[PDB]
């Protein structure tokens, strides 16, 4: 009945999610578990294995024009920039999003992308590390932790969030709707027209609720657990944003990409 419209929304978002994000959670998991006919990712657990992995992961393709912790961070930065492009394209596919006031689209993306980046990282992560370079590399958690300050502390809170978030066991079809809900948050600072945002989000949440009922019938109040994580994640992103503004000012030899600057300026 009304369920059917919600199911079609879910499916439309899935299809556009698949087009927008080349590396899905399914593909990432296939890789992390070895349930894949492709070669196993090169493991980077220290300085020397980074040097050894450079061909497999194409690490020199980051800087066609430095210190290690900086080089790793620039790699992370490179992908983040592309993540913002993917998130932005996906946002345009959300019914109603592009009819919003253009300053509101910007505001929604500006605050939303970091929250989504955390969920994207979770798909790429286990307890011990993160998939990099389109699944061709695996950088260990302890190697990232062992980097000098402030770089040593950058990735770890995302690892912490990921292990908890991954216990929910969402798939791509869930994630597609969850991500739509994050973007269309009517309580972002500086929004002009809260109402048409909340109207869309209301439909997305209903879609999310039904999706989780149907896709995870054995998981009682997964919806509730999911919304609580979404709130936790806002709080967490505040500290992520702080650390970058710190790094931008305190590290001279590292250039922060202009797009990333746009999204960190005047934020919390």
């Amino acid at each position: 009945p009304e369920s059917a419209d919600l199911r079609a929304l879910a499916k439309h978002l899935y299809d556009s999610y698949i087009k927008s994000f080349p590396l899905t959670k399914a593909k990432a998991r296939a890789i992390l578990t070895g349930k894949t006919t492709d070669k196993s990712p090169f493991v980077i657990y220290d300085m020397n294995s980074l040097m050894m992995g450079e061909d497999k992961i194409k690490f020199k393709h980051i800087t066609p024009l430095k210190e290690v912790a900086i080089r790793i961070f620039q790699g992370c930065q490179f992908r983040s920039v592309e993540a913002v492009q993917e998130i932005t394209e996906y946002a345009k596919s959300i019914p109603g999003f592009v009819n919003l006031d253009l300053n509101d689209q910007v505001t929604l993306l500006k605050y939303g992308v970091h929250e989504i980046i955390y969920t994207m990282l979770a798909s790429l992560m286990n307890k011990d590390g993160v998939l990099i370079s389109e699944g061709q590399g695996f950088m260990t958690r302890e190697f990232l932790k062992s980097l000098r300050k402030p770089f040593g502390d950058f990735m770890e809170p995302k690892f912490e969030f990921a292990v908890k978030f991954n216990a929910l066991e969402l798939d791509d079809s869930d994630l597609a709707i969850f991500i739509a809900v994050i973007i269309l948050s009517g309580d972002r600072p500086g929004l002009l027209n809260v109402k048409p945002i909340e109207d869309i989000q209301d439909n997305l949440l209903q879609a999310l609720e039904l999706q989780l009922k149907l896709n995870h019938p054995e998981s009682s109040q997964l919806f509730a657990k999911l919304l609580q994580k979404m709130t936790d994640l806002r709080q967490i992103v505040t500290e992520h944003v702080q650390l970058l503004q710190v790094i931008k000012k305190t590290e001279t030899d590292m250039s922060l990409h202009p797009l990333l600057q746009e999204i960190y300026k005047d934020l919390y």
């Binding site: 492009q85 253009l102 500006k110 797009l259 746009e262 999204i263």
Partner: peptide
């Protein structure tokens, strides 16, 4: 301004 974001959204 958010010039790049604007560009990504409009195009």
């Amino acid at each position: 301004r958010h010039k790049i974001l604007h560009r990504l959204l409009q195009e």
